Structure 1
């Protein structure tokens, strides 16, 4: 389904209003989901939260009719970045098969982090197989967006490069990989190969040569 974004500054209190409003008495569930990972049921009844979830995650109870269902995350941290689903049940509507929309929460004001580039030359066994791959491994950078640039000696090289879109790590930083494929002759006949990783305003270079 469609995704509705939301930005909350680091340390503030996030207010995630539900996608669909109830027509009668409600019983709303709140799920936390970061793609590539199992969801985390935050609140099951209108305000009941399971164990293993801090008190900063709160939901609105159904006291009087008219109150909208909103998940409140006080003291937001970089780990609170995920998709938030509002599974809505009410007396009026039917059986809630759809989990609803998806509130994409991003936490602003996080510390900027420079990448850690690591470039490996083509392995011997790979060269023995008449193939050669340069790998450029980028990690521990925030905000998660970098640009790679491959150069043979000083001249650029763009034919044969494959780069990963950034991926959040367990430490709330990002990682990306770049693979330059070339024939083993183009690896010997050149002097050196470089991988330029430009992140935010700066650029970092790591170079390798067959020696």
Structure 2
């Protein structure tokens, strides 16, 4: 029943920064609060317990504070291996609820154009009476991008897509399925990728 609200939901930051994450409990949970670091595809990792005690082996740049309903995790100087999602958790009372997480993302290059790579259908897929256009996207920043597809210069479809960090840059991709007659009969097809004030469009043609 006890709600745990973190804020911000996400933030961008650079090596050396001071990061401060906030967790608010919907009621008094005393000193009974833990913080965890979670990397993608990895187990959460315990950092802080009792609101302010560093767990064994946890670097000193991590520290927590708070009591009652207002809690804080603070990273004194953000290190490279610290981009991750940080969760607060109350263990004061059942059911030991977690905060929704706060993504701490590499700032990167916020005004860079998206890098876009576009592959046409292979002769193999065309022979299987099918065909797929493959648009690959690599960005130096965390934000969502918009992808629009074009047949010649007419729009086909268009969606917003979130990117995810990679094993560094953020990645996404989009797919457009076509009949073989669709691919052969148009002069070209295009994937167009937009982030804020930058757009990159790549074009392919049956050749």
Common fold by TM > 0.5: yes
Match of 2:35 among 6, 30, 41: 30
Gaps of 5+ in 1: none
1:210/1:66 CA distance change after superposition, 3 Å: closer
Residue 60 (structure 2) pairs with residue 55 (structure 1): yes
Q: How many residues matched?
A: 197
The match for 2:74 is: 72
Superposed displacement of residue 98, structure 1? 2.1
The match for 2:166 is: 169
The match for 1:84 is: 87
Contact 1:77 1:107 in 2 (8 A): no
Query: For 1:186 and 1:162, how far apart are their aligned partners in 2?
Result: 21
What is the RMSD of the two structures over their aligned residues, measured on CA atoms? 3.3
1:133-172 matched pairs, under 5 angstroms:
133-158=132-157, 164-171=161-168
Gaps of 5+ in 2: none
Query: For 1:203 and 1:127, how far apart are their aligned partners in 2?
Result: 30
SS at match of 2:74: strand
Query: For 1:121 and 1:48, how far apart are their aligned partners in 2?
Result: 53
The match for 1:99 is: 97
Deviations 1:144-180 (A, max 9, x none): 221112111222222xx77743223342x32111111
TM-score of the two chains, using structure 2 as the length reference: 0.76
Residue 35 (structure 2) pairs with residue 39 (structure 1): no
Residue 177 (structure 2) pairs with residue 196 (structure 1): no
Residue 119 (structure 2) pairs with residue 117 (structure 1): no
Contact 2:6 2:21 in 1 (8 A): no
